């Protein structure tokens, strides 16, 4: 939705992905996404035809303008929330360690009244 605001002003044709343009652009900030959509307008005005009636910007020059834009620093640091969803069934075996991790961190953060009424302490790390 950062990209869909900038795409709305420019006349870009309907044959352009967004999810692949979101996924390939990991490491950028909101200033570099404007300049990516600035540079893909330039190589579609730079190279062009003689008709000048259909502003066709396609996936050829978004991937061309991805090549010569360097990514911003000061991102890989501090702490990162949201990553990928991993289920419990991916970890094969370890049934007893899954039981001990559930009884000391998820039951004390999801059902807090039934933990304190039964008289059990929360382990503090």
């Amino acid at each position: 939705e950062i990209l869909q605001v900038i795409t709305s002003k420019m006349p870009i044709s309907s044959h352009v992905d967004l999810g692949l343009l979101a996924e390939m652009t990991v490491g950028y900030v909101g200033a570099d996404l404007t300049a990516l959509c600035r540079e893909a307008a330039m190589h579609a005005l730079l190279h062009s035809e003689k008709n000048q009636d259909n502003p066709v910007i396609d996936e050829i020059d978004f991937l061309e303008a991805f090549k010569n834009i360097q990514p911003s620093s000061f991102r890989s640091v501090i702490g990162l929330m949201d990553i990928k969803p991993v289920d419990w069934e991916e970890i094969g075996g370890l049934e007893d360690v899954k039981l001990k991790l559930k009884q000391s961190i998820e039951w004390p953060l999801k059902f807090p009244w039934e933990f304190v009424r039964m008289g059990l302490t929360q382990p503090k790390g």
Partner: protein, 73 residues
């Protein structure tokens, strides 16, 4: 025997125990545990009664007999 009555009587003030669980066969089935392992039986029986039917009310003998088998010495 009578010291072990007072450790269960202090630990029954904080958790709901049924009126069917009787203290006389709990005193008989300890048979020289330590004073810290008698606290760990009451900790383990509460976690087994929450693992089955987490919206719970009370602890019965089937939680207590299974918790005595898990904590051994």
């Amino acid at each position: 025997a009578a010291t072990r009555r007072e450790i269960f009587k202090l630990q029954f003030h904080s958790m709901p125990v049924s009126n069917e669980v009787d203290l006389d066969e709990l005193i008989l089935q300890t048979d020289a545990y330590s004073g810290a392992e008698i606290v760990a039986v009451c900790r383990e029986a509460a976690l087994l009664a929450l693992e089955e039917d987490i919206q719970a009310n009370l602890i019965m003998k089937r939680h207590f007999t299974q918790a005595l088998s898990t904590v051994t010495p």
